[PDB]
């Protein structure tokens, strides 16, 4: 049993995409399907639902008149046409099937049995921008120095130190989404305070969505 | 309009019993369904129709309906059980058929001795002050449980505008870490004497300080 | 001494409505406390209720026994889904404790055939029900077969019931209906239940001896 979803990505506000949810190893034509989203760190929210017959289609309030459910049982695939997308629509969108079909007249509801892996939809009015890498100088026997990777879009960014030689004490924090729609993160390595005036520390920042590669050298201050 | 009330956090020790509750008006008549979501993973159905346990779900998971309160019970709690748990009902008695979730209850398993946070505070760099931008970086690592609060201070006055804190994240050493950024203008960085990052974890607060006159 | 039903009528106590609580093996007459649902917490007509009241009024013996054990009499069907918000208990969904609402196991309601022979030394009162979905979509979700029927027969009773799929007024949140039937079994007789859907089988019967 498995549900494969895709079709997601980055959309500019007011835009549209179509998510798909393909089925394998079960008779997709007899199960009732669902779409459930999850904000970048928030909780679960039901988007919409459809019967196996394609007869009943219900939606949540916040997506009515903007999202449409469809399914082609002939292709074992469920669809979510998302029009007039907004910044608050940014979330991970899961498809899921109900254990047994809903018995409406008798009030019988069963849970959601199998879920998709997730497909991420970001609605941001931000052009893809390379990051500005600023040095976090060591304070004047284990010193702390790092790299501030500020104002990039979208995710992700990979940070390495000394081109890969220094991996002990290296620690790259998760990124934060600022008000301007741009991300920023930091990666700090803890080194002996003695190798400050000898060993050279250079962090390697790579942002593939912009083909930007920055190598900044982190030294103390005078 | 119908609302499923749910506690946000529950902490249990290895081997004990944890009870997650879900409150709602006539929750048992509707049928409450429970889901287990581990960090980065899809949800997992662990209980449907109040008491019914899906296949492959261990008998350690059970459910009861005490009127307007539903409870998910996990026995012999282990570290694998640590996850976010959501409850679910269907509602046809509040408008068109709509589905309602709970806020989710994070189950912390307390499978490691407590760890004090290692705080490092960086002032805005010269390069950054040269780009007409200012960011203070406050870096927290090696603490446990992963629950921490960060307050910034102007001089000795609380600042709450322009602060950006990440949710605690798991490290390799099974401890947690998080970062917090204070974005200012270069003038504000110079107009004050000393800024402060107060990081509070398990009652004991740590404070680091940076200043432009340095 | 009479029978003091606390908060149920006869139909509420005899069907096993979850609201009734707490052992009488003889009673002169019955004290029926009224209720709004008319005893039937699931909407439905009770066929020959006065006839059953009149013959429940004075009994000298009254044993309740499991005519069809829940855990062994229904192996090809699902005897665990049959609860409703119309008949609640302790906040959750429940059902009449003397009946079982059978529902298709998987996507098939294979033909049901179950017989009970009166081994007792007295008459046996048997209660069952016929369910009627509100839409044919509910019929297939409940019983898979659209051409369902129910046959109940003994030596003195015989009737074939057919599903009456109709959208009735919303009573107790339900626009389906559920009729209730009964009959007495003579001390040497056999009652049989045939069904391809819509049958709410008996779980508990009553062996009784009446007076006059």
Automatic annotation (TrEMBL), chain C:
Belongs to the influenza viruses hemagglutinin family. In natural infection, inactive HA is matured into HA1 and HA2 outside the cell by one or more trypsin-like, arginine-specific endoprotease secreted by the bronchial epithelial cells. One identified protease that may be involved in this process is secreted in lungs by club cells. The chain holds residues 65 to 278 of 566 of the full protein. Homotrimer of disulfide-linked HA1-HA2. Interacts with human CACNA1C. It is found in: Host apical cell membrane; Virion membrane. Coiled coil: none annotated. It comes from Influenza A virus. Disulfide bonds join 8-20, 41-87. This is Hemagglutinin. Binds to sialic acid-containing receptors on the cell surface, bringing about the attachment of the virus particle to the cell. This attachment induces virion internalization either through clathrin-dependent endocytosis or through clathrin- and caveolin-independent pathway. Plays a major role in the determination of host range restriction and virulence. Class I viral fusion protein. Responsible for penetration of the virus into the cell cytoplasm by mediating the fusion of the membrane of the endocytosed virus particle with the endosomal membrane. It comes from the Viruses.
């Amino acid at each position: 049993v498995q549900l494969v979803e895709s079709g997601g990505g980055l959309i500019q506000p007011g835009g549209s995409l179509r998510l798909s949810c393909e089925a394998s190893a079960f008779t997709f034509s007899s199960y009732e399907m669902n779409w459930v989203r999850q904000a970048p760190g928030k909780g679960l929210e039901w988007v919409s639902y459809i019967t196996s017959s394609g007869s009943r289609i219900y939606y949540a309030d916040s997506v009515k008149g903007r999202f449409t459910i469809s399914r082609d049982n002939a292709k074992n695939s469920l669809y979510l046409q998302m029009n007039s997308l907004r910044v608050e629509d940014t979330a991970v969108y899961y498809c899921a099937r109900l254990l047994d079909s809903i018995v409406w007249g008798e009030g019988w509801y069963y849970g959601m049995d199998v879920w998709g892996q997730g497909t991420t939809v970001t609605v941001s009015g931000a052009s893809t921008k390379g990051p500005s890498v600023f040095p976090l100088a060591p304070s004047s026997g284990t010193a702390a120095l790092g790299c501030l990777v500020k104002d990039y879009f979208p995710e992700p960014v990979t940070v390495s130190w000394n081109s890969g030689a220094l991996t002990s004490g290296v620690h790259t924090f998760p990124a934060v989404l600022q008000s301007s729609g741009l991300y920023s993160l930091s990666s700090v390595v803890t080194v002996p305070s003695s190798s400050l005036g000898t060993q050279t520390y250079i962090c390697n920042v790579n942002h593939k969505p912009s083909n930007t590669k920055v190598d900044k050298r982190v030294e103390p201050k005078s | 309009s119908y609302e499923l009330t749910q506690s946000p956090s529950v902490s249990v020790a290895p081997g004990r019993t944890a009870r997650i509750t879900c409150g709602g008006n006539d929750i048992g008549l509707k049928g409450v369904h429970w889901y287990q979501q581990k960090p980065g993973q899809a949800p997992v159905l662990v209980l449907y129709d109040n008491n019914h346990r899906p296949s492959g779900i261990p008998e350690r998971f059970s459910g009861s309906i005490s009127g307007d309160t539903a409870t998910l019970t996990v026995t012999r709690v282990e570290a694998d059980d640590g996850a976010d748990y959501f409850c679910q009902v269907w509602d046809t008695s509040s408008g068109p058929p709509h589905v309602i979730f709970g806020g989710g209850t994070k189950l912390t398993v307390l499978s490691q001795p407590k760890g004090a946070p290692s705080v490092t505070l960086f002032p805005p760099s010269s390069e950054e002050l040269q780009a007409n931008k200012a960011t203070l970086v406050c870096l927290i690592s090696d603490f446990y449980p992963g629950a921490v609060t960060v307050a910034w201070k102007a001089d000795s006055s609380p600042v709450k505008a322009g602060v950006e804190t990440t949710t605690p994240s798991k490290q390799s050493n099974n401890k947690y870490a998080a970062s917090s950024y204070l974005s200012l203008t270069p003038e504000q960085w110079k107009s004050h004497r000393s800024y402060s990052c107060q990081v509070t974890h398990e009652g004991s607060t740590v404070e680091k300080t940076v200043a432009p006159t340095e | 001494a009479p029978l003091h039903l606390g908060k149920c009528n006869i139909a509420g106590w005899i069907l096993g409505n979850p609201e009734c609580e707490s052992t009488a093996s003889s009673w002169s007459y019955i004290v029926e406390t009224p209720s709004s649902d008319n005893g039937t917490c699931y909407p439905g007509d009770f066929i020959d209720y006065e006839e059953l009241r009149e013959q429940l009024s004075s009994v000298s013996s009254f044993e309740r026994f499991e005519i069809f054990p829940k855990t062994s009499s229904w192996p090809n069907h699902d005897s665990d889904k049959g609860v409703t918000a119309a008949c609640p208990h302790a906040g959750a969904k429940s059902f009449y404790k003397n009946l079982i609402w059978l529902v298709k196991k998987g996507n098939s309601y294979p033909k049901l055939s179950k017989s009970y022979i009166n081994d007792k030394g007295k008459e046996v009162l048997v209660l069952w029900g016929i369910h009627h979905p509100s839409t044919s979509a509910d019929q297939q979700s409940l019983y898979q077969n659209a051409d369902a029927y129910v046959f109940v027969g003994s030596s003195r009773y015989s009737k074939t019931f057919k599903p009456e799929i109709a959208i009735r007024p919303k009573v107790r949140d339900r626009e389906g209906r559920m009729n209730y039937y009964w009959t007495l079994v003579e001390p040497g007789d056999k009652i049989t239940f045939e069904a391809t859907g819509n049958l709410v089988v008996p779980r508990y019967a009553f062996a009784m001896e009446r007076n006059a």
